[PDB]
């Protein structure tokens, strides 16, 4: 599914990824209720959970 990401986020640790406001990310893990694996463009990482929206 997709998620838009509704802040910037700059990658913290070696498991995240950054992402822009407005970018379309695919979910790819939501396990996790504070950080959810995404991938932005070509990369794939965590970010934090509540910066991004479910679109489906």
Same mark, same amino acid.
């Given at each position: 599914?997709?998620?838009? @990401?509704? /802040? %910037? /986020?700059?990658?913290?640790?070696? @498991?995240?990824?950054?992402?822009? *406001?407005? %970018? ?12 959810? *694996?995404?991938?932005?463009? %070509? ?5 934090? @959970? @509540? /910066?991004? *929206? *479910?679109? %489906?």
């Amino acid at each position: 599914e997709l998620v838009l @990401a509704l /802040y %910037d /986020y700059q990658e913290k640790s070696p @498991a995240e990824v950054t992402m822009k *406001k407005g %970018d379309i990310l695919t979910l790819l893990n939501s396990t996790n209720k504070d950080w959810w *694996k995404v991938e932005v463009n %070509d990369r794939q990482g965590f970010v934090p @959970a @509540a /910066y991004v *929206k *479910k679109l %489906d």
